[PDB]
Amino acid sequence: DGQATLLNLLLRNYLHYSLYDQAEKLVSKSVFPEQANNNEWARYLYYTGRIKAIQLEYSEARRTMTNALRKAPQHTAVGFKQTVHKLLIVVELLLGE
Amino acid sequence: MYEQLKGEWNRKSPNLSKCGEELGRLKLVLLELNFLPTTGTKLTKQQLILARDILEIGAQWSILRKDIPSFERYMAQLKCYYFDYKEQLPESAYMHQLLGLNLLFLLSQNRVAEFHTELERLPAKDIQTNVYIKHPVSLEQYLMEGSYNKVFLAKGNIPAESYTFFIDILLDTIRDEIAGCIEKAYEKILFTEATRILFFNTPKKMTDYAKKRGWVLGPNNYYSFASQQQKPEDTTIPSTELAKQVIEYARQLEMIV
Amino acid sequence: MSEKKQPVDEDNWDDDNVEDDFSNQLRAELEKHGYKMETS
Amino acid sequence: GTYTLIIRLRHNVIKTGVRMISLSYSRISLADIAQKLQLDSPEDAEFIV
Amino acid sequence: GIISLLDEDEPQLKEFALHKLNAVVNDFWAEISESVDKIEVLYEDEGFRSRQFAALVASKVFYHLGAFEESLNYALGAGDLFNVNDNSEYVETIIAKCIDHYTKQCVENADLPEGEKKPIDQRLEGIVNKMFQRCLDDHKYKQAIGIALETRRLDVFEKTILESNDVPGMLAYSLKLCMSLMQNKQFRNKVLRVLVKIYMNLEKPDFINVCQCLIFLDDPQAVSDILEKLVKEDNLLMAYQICFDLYESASQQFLSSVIQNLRT
């Protein structure tokens, strides 16, 4: 639970900014927070999805964009589900399908 | 104010006996004040604007001497200086023609993930303004598809500066690309068409490539060995891999997990 | 439950695939044929 | 801020074009395909293809 | 970004770089986390004035990345600059590896000490007995009784029978604490035989521990020796519980073997 929150909370301005922590997030051990309660675990897959988006989607992360979409609750779409619904097939337009 | 530099920096001293005094002079900058970004004392800029301009001209003649491994040390520390949020020059007469110069050498480095990871600092400067940085990204954008002739138009159609060391790496890394593009299923090409697809009239560079690869020198002839024959009709490699996979089905079918 | 923070703020599909191939291709075919009777 | 990813789609558009026409026509001149794809240049329409 | 100036070949810019490796070792710590590991280059180099500080910060960056043995070895060879501080959240990191690899090596050394023993890097035991002296000087001896077992070293446990703590139940009850969680016979019998002679060299020699230990220990002559000390001492009121706990808890083979040393 410190393994969980302190990594998306680490991420959210690194994405917003431009730090090198993406390969840091490759070599990070805490890429698993081990069943982080379907909120941090759910959005975490999106926050690591835009990582390989800006580092050149090779069809690797559309399954985890899709996974981040299918792990999201019954709240609304304009929170972030609009944004994952956008980027999720942005990258499929990068593929061709 | 410990300047020592302001006489032979603009007049050309290409690898003369200025450069060792310049490097130990930068050591004298290190003994005075660290290039740690000096978070306090914002009024003290002489360690930042002046010494940074020293470090970017020291970046600048590094391509003039063609010192590649030190060049990214200089330019990397420059990018670490524009990493600072402290109110500085927002840019200069150099920041486009140096950051995008790093984008153009880095593009010649054939590291495209780093080519796109470096674009997360200058947004609006992409298309809506800053044509001198629009030129490398539209350039490599043309290198993405089969835009070749437009790339060799850009080659020369450089508006910014020389960029010669970069467009010669670019002159090569496309020489092997055409030198592969002859190797597709084509007809007998005469000694004019593929002779003029690059930028040559008749040197023995067509003998360099015609003896390097096939499409051999013939009776106005380039030879097509479009064989592509041997590789199909493999059952045994599926008769091993599928022999793995079917057992892998049987493991997670009856054996309790 | 469902805290969900704010960083940002049939009947429909076969017609949508008709819009996929056929979003805007000549719309009202009624006179183009009669404009090709004299040219073709 | 997706614009830096939107900008690279022209590669994928021309892949859609060459897959579409290469699937549709069998024996087609290169002096037609740049004209239908509004590429303005057959001489590198050899090269994209 | 400061990692870029590791090609100077002047042994002062390496020192100027390691000026900036201890305070800013959290932000571009992530940068030089896996990318550059030229610590061992200058560390094994003939270039001195570095190799001292560098294995410290290698023992910082390789720590969090799961290379606990890499930070353990560079923790060993890092020098006086390494162990100069114990005022962070990092002495806890290095003792939990060094005492660990110490004593889990010393179980194998408890098997075979003779030959192929430890090449101690001069603090691999130095902070064992040093932090042990911290446990002695920090007034705690319910733990200093414990790590003295954990080190698999006998004479330092023999040293802690005379310490800043006194001996009312200590080094007497410690044996009740050891008979329960006592693992085998091989580590039991040596400690058991080494404590009960200084129990005889104690001011008042206890008798139930030296009877009970010796029937736990199979020494059918030493109880005839201290039994001879009670014949010479001439009091059968204290030559009593040494003898009827001996009959009560001893066996027929043990009494029929000790009868030769008792009648002689």
Side-chain angles (χ1 to χ4, degrees), chain D:
Chain D
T2 182
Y3 182 78
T4 182
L5 296 175
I6 303 300
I7 196 64
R8 66 186 69 186
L9 267 299
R10 295 176 63 87
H11 182 78
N12 293 313
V13 173
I14 200 64
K15 293 296 175 290
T16 304
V18 69
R19 187 178 295 112
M20 180 178 176
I21 305 160
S22 71
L23 192 146
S24 178
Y25 295 160
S26 176
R27 184 172 179 263
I28 178 63
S29 177
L30 60 93
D32 295 329
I33 188 167
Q35 289 74 7
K36 185 171 69 172
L37 287 175
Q38 58 185 354
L39 188 61
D40 204 9
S41 62
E43 68 273 16
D44 59 355
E46 291 181 354
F47 295 153
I48 287 101
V49 172

Side-chain angles (χ1 to χ4, degrees), chain E residues 105-164:
Chain E
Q105 186 57 255
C106 288
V107 174
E108 194 273 331
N109 297 116
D111 193 4
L112 187 61
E114 192 271 331
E116 55 93 31
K117 63 180 71 65
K118 296 180 72 172
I120 295 101
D121 194 74
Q122 290 89 27
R123 291 184 295 271
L124 182 62
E125 66 185 0
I127 68 169
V128 170
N129 57 7
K130 181 176 74 174
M131 187 60 72
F132 184 77
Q133 293 297 321
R134 300 290 182 89
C135 293
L136 298 178
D137 293 332
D138 286 332
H139 185 72
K140 186 69 178 294
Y141 296 100
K142 294 186 287 184
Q143 290 299 109
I145 199 68
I147 292 98
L149 268 71
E150 295 296 325
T151 180
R152 296 291 180 269
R153 183 181 292 112
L154 279 77
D155 59 351
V156 65
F157 184 78
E158 181 66 28
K159 183 175 70 69
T160 55
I161 80 170
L162 181 62
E163 60 185 2
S164 176

